[PDB]
Design an enzyme around this catalytic site. Sequence first.
Site, PDB file in Angstrom:
ATOM      1  CG  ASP A 153      -2.314  -0.575   0.967  1.00  0.00           C
ATOM      2  OD1 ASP A 153      -2.489  -1.287  -0.053  1.00  0.00           O
ATOM      3  OD2 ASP A 153      -3.246  -0.290   1.776  1.00  0.00           O
ATOM      4  CD  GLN A 183       2.201   8.214  -9.575  1.00  0.00           C
ATOM      5  OE1 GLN A 183       1.941   7.014  -9.401  1.00  0.00           O
ATOM      6  NE2 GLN A 183       1.293   9.185  -9.371  1.00  0.00           N
ATOM      7  CB  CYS A 234      -0.976   1.269 -11.625  1.00  0.00           C
ATOM      8  SG  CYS A 234      -0.258   2.636 -12.479  1.00  0.00           S
ATOM      9  CB  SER A 235      -4.602   3.920  -9.337  1.00  0.00           C
ATOM     10  OG  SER A 235      -5.909   4.454  -9.066  1.00  0.00           O
ATOM     11  CB  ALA A 236      -2.179   7.554 -11.995  1.00  0.00           C
ATOM     12  N   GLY A 237      -1.693   4.943 -13.984  1.00  0.00           N
ATOM     13  CA  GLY A 237      -1.022   4.521 -15.197  1.00  0.00           C
ATOM     14  C   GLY A 237       0.291   5.218 -15.489  1.00  0.00           C
ATOM     15  CB  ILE A 238       2.237   7.739 -14.614  1.00  0.00           C
ATOM     16  CG1 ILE A 238       1.678   8.299 -13.289  1.00  0.00           C
ATOM     17  CG2 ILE A 238       1.398   8.296 -15.777  1.00  0.00           C
ATOM     18  CD1 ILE A 238       1.683   9.833 -13.217  1.00  0.00           C
ATOM     19  N   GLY A 239       2.918   5.304 -12.480  1.00  0.00           N
ATOM     20  CA  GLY A 239       3.821   4.927 -11.418  1.00  0.00           C
ATOM     21  C   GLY A 239       4.361   3.523 -11.566  1.00  0.00           C
ATOM     22  NE  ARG A 240       1.338   0.383  -6.987  1.00  0.00           N
ATOM     23  CZ  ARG A 240       0.332  -0.008  -6.214  1.00  0.00           C
ATOM     24  NH1 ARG A 240      -0.550  -0.901  -6.633  1.00  0.00           N
ATOM     25  NH2 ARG A 240       0.226   0.489  -4.974  1.00  0.00           N
ATOM     26  CB  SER A 241       1.850   1.692 -15.523  1.00  0.00           C
ATOM     27  OG  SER A 241       0.609   1.204 -15.026  1.00  0.00           O
TER      28      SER A 241
END
Length: 284
Positions: free
Chosen positions: A181, A262, A215-222
């Site tokens: 998390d 991020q 992911c949620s925004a599509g920039i961090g984990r993605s």
Amino acid sequence: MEMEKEFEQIDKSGSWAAIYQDIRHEASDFPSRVAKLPKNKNRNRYRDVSPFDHSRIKLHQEDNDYINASLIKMEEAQRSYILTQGPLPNTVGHFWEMVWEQKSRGVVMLNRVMEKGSLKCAQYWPQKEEKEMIFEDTNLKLTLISEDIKSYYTVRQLELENLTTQETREILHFHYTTWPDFGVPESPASFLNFLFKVRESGSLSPEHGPVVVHCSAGIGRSGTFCLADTCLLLMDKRKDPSSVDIKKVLLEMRKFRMGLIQTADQLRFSYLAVIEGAKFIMGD
């Protein structure tokens, strides 16, 4: 500069926060007019995360072609990826229209439906074989065929049918379930394993459409997923694997989608993942 040394250097110096800010500063900026139009406000999950107009994916329909999705085209590595946000209630239908129209084979999912007590994306696939989902605005049917659940990730076979022509396709759903998390994983071992499983499936190969990752925004984990892949792929392909500059790759990718990676913890973790991955790519 061998990234493994560059790494020990930043780590001992505790400079990670300044490296990361150098990237934020040098990163490209291009217009996002289509994303900011008013008729598309409810197609965006976050106000500060929009796709550039020059690289956005378009839905094949005359009504409204917008979706929050970008095509990253890595030309030297010969890899393509589509990065998108976790789908919203009113965009699950558009999401699977995207999957159809771009002829994708895999969906990659790096987040849980609920994290930190809030909803981080919609429940956009079916959870039981006998309870299929239908998407009436885009005339598509989706069915769960099998499911294989493991300690660190889950793989699902789904059947996407185009109700207008009755063609059907097999989509593979690669869902990484154990990213914490807060912060980042302590070891990249399971994240690297997850990648090789995606690779082994064929889903990244050019006989198919580009893979959809989110992911949620599509920039961090993605971002972490496809920076690592590309970087390892380049280490395979070059006379001199130590010539791979991870900062330069990130900056090239950021020409196609804003924000990729991020936090500074993610940047570090990305280095870590490539270094350990290399210790298979280079024969070991």
